[PDB]
Write a protein that binds this ligand. Structure first.
Ligand SMILES: N[C@@H]1[C@@H](O)[C@H](O[C@@H]2O[C@H](CO)[C@@H](O[C@@H]3O[C@H](CO)[C@@H](O[C@@H]4O[C@H](CO)[C@@H](O[C@@H]5O[C@H](CO)[C@@H](O[C@@H]6O[C@H](CO)[C@@H](O[C@@H]7O[C@H](CO)[C@@H](O[C@@H]8O[C@H](CO)[C@@H](O)[C@H](O)[C@H]8N)[C@H](O)[C@H]7N)[C@H](O)[C@H]6N)[C@H](O)[C@H]5N)[C@H](O)[C@H]4N)[C@H](O)[C@H]3N)[C@H](O)[C@H]2N)[C@@H](CO)O[C@H]1O
Ligand SMILES: *[C@@H]1O[C@H](CO)[C@@H](O[C@@H]2O[C@H](CO)[C@@H](O)[C@H](O)[C@H]2NC(C)=O)[C@H](O)[C@H]1NC(C)=O
Length: 377
């Protein structure tokens, strides 16, 4: 079992996946307890009073979603609550908090009481990002770095004596890592660091690219935009391998390409791809939306024979890059070879949990589990 192994498999849960039609609906009881060692509930948010608060009272509270995910502690899974996420990280409110010691002191006592009220095992910090607010390093003050480090210390000082966990989801981008993170302090105090080794490329690049390359590719604009560089950089900055869990995407980045005639990497893009029926977000497709396009709508798949990155698929002017089972096995062997703490997925509700594509239920996540449990490297 994963729980008896030397590896973590940290699964993000998202409360908003409930609000999807038909088979895209995901509920707490859809969580497969054999596939995760840790479940992280996305998200709670930062209230205007500087205190953590529920993001969606109808699900989290009225329909007892918090309690129904904390249910999984009964299997020996550790269940944490994540604070933040992309939308909540817009603007200055996390910076205002961490630069104000009085506000941090108030926040910390309330946050631990909040976790204990609902039975969470710990807190996951997902501020995107200290200093580089929503990856704009011109926006935030340098002092976000020390402020975040002191927030992590102050949370640790209250959580650790109670046996509660503290983790963070962190940038894979060199520039953001350098500006936002006091890596030695975080590495010492956090129980794990979930490196978000995905979203390296997307519609914002104005050209096609892979959501989550593992190794450098000769046509890359930089040597930094791949999981191999990112994970080694976190270690170079002072993170122990055992503290790192490597993120893997259960989804793809989609693109509307400018001309249907060329369809390779780095080709011009006019917009995000057309939204999926279930996830309804331009530029984004769940794995179960992608595999259906390939299986039943004739999308053409291009693989990398050197396995530096997963596949992409295209049809007409639509183009999506994503991870398949093959590249996932390669990434998990990479995790094992570096003796990392384990793997992480974003997110439970985006894998093909319903077996819509006939590859079995949870094909990507089961591929991770099987390779993590395989002794050979
Ligand atoms: N009541 C119910 C409700 O509950 C429910 O509501 C739901 O709630 C949930 C939760 O809030 C919602 O989910 C969220 O949905 C959103 C989508 O709508 C998601 O948003 C996305 O999030 C992802 C991340 O998770 C974002 O991804 C990021 O995107 C940005 C860009 O947008 C990327 O940032 C860019 O990064 C690149 C590098 O990668 C960087 O480029 C560099 O810039 C530098 C500096 O400028 C350059 O350097 C210079 O270069 C030149 C030459 O090269 C030199 O001369 C210079 O010297 C040099 N300095 C360099 O070239 C580049 N390397 C860019 O600058 C940077 N901007 C970022 O990386 C990427 N991570 C994404 O954008 C978001 N859209 C969100 O994640 C979800 N959680 C849910 O949707 C919501 N509905 C409701 C549901 O129905 O129902 C109610 O009932
Ligand atoms: C994985 O990433 C690491 C580190 O970024 C690469 O190892 C480096 O190899 C390059 C060759 O230029 C050197 O810059 C460093 O001297 C190496 N560092 C270490 C610690 O070996 C490694 O090449 C990358 N792997 C692949 C397969 O691309």
């Amino acid at each position: 079992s994963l729980l008896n192994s030397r590896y973590k498999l940290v699964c993000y849960y998202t409360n908003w996946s409930w609000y999807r039609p038909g088979i895209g609906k995901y509920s707490p009881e859809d969580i497969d307890p054999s596939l995760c060692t840790h479940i992280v509930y996305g998200f709670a948010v930062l209230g205007n009073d500087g205190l953590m608060t529920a993001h969606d009272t109808w699900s989290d509270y009225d329909n007892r979603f918090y309690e129904r995910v904390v249910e999984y502690k009964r299997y020996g899974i550790k269940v944490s609550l994540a604070l933040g996420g992309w939308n909540d990280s817009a603007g200055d409110k996390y910076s205002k908090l961490v630069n104000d010691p009085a506000a941090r002191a108030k926040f910390v006592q309330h946050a631990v009481a909040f976790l204990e009220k609902y039975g969470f095992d710990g807190l996951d910090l997902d501020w995107e990002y200290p200093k580089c607010w929503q990856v704009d390093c011109s926006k935030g003050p340098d002092s976000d770095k020390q402020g975040f480090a002191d927030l992590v210390h102050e949370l640790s000082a209250v959580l650790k004596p109670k046996g509660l966990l503290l983790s963070a989801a962190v940038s894979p981008n060199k520039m953001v890592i350098d500006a936002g993170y006091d890596v030695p302090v975080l590495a010492r105090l956090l129980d794990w660091i979930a490196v978000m080794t995905y979203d390296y490329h997307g519609q914002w690049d104005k050209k096609t690219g892979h959501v989550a390359p593992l190794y450098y590719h000769p046509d890359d604009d930089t040597t930094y935009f791949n999981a191999n560089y990112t994970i080694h950089y976190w270690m170079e900055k002072g993170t122990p391998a055992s503290k790192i869990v490597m993120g893997m995407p259960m989804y793809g980045q989609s693109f509307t390409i400018e001309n249907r005639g060329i369809h390779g990497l780095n080709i011009p893009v006019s917009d995000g791809g057309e939204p999926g029926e279930y996830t309804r977000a331009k530029g984004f497709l769940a794995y179960y939306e992608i595999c259906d396009r390939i299986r039943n709508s004739g999308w053409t798949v291009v693989k990398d024979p050197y396995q530096r990155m997963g596949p992409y698929a295209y049809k007409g002017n639509q183009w999506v890059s994503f991870d398949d089972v093959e590249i996932i096995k390669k990434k998990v062997n990479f995790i094992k070879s570096l003796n990392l703490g384990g793997g992480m997925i974003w997110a439970l509700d985006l894998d093909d949990y319903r077996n819509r594509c006939g590859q079995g239920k949870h094909p990507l996540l089961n591929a991770i589990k099987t390779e993590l449990l395989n002794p050979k490297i």
